[PDB]
Amino acid sequence: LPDLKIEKLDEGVYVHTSFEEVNGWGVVPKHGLVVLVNAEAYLIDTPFTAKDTEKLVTWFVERGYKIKGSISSHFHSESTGGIEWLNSRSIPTYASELTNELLKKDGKVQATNSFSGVNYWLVKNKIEVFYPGPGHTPDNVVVWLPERKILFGGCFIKPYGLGNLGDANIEAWPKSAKLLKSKYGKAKLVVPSHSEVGDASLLKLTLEQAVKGLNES
């Protein structure tokens, strides 16, 4: 199985890329991010594996970066596989109230730090979390990196298909993609969860794909 990939994306923001054979297109590259406030690192989404979380973690730890915490876009393992480990390591793990009710609903270890509402600042003016509303998952959120004008749509931003409809609010995705396409259009880059990093246009295509997605069924 493909090795973890940590590629600087922009200033103080890396794109860790884990791979889990969720039998979709076989092996899938789950793109996450490690926002480096300054001397501190934040795992935006955690690899589906503790191992990779450990690797990603120490990769940054090893380079003098204290890991203040992780933040998950949604409850799936793509974004929570490491909360467990991160928790054993006493890493402040962050997930929405809705994701945790979902993690707890799935008997998965829940992130120790919750938060709710349309928006939550994980870091005053640097790591903004956001509930565009239901979409890929009922709890799915997106993390905006104001400073770099980078958004981590994660699995919400699905520009070429809606992907896993399993836990998706096909009826609410559009509304969400629009509330999203409306709040973060100032975006310089949008970070999907399985596609190359695109620009503010991904917010529109996700919308299109969502309505499109809805039109069918």
Query: DSSP strand E in the chain: where?
Result: 5-10, 13-20, 28-31, 33-36, 40-44, 66-71, 93-94, 119-123, 127-130, 142-145, 150-154, 189-192
- Decide whether 69 or 163 has the Cβ nearer to Zn ion: 163
Stretch that binds Zn ion, among 38-46, 50-58, 127-135, 188-196 (CB under 5 A): 188-196
Which residues have a Cβ under 8 Å from the Cβ of 125 and sit 6 or more positions away? 146, 147
Contact 174, 138 (CB under 8 A): no
Interface with Zn ion (CB under 5 A), residue from 80, 193, 195, 206: 193
Contact 142, 173 (CB under 8 A): no
Contact map string, positions 90 to 119, toward Zn ion, x by CB under 5 A: ------------------------------
Stretch that binds Zn ion, among 9-17, 69-77, 86-94, 114-122 (CB under 5 A): 69-77
Question: By CB under 5 A, is residue 76 in contact with Zn ion?
Answer: yes
The CB-of-31 to Zn ion minimum distance in angstroms stands at: 9
Question: By CB under 5 A, is residue 155 in contact with Zn ion?
Answer: yes
Residues that bind Zn ion (CB under 5 A): 76, 78, 155, 193
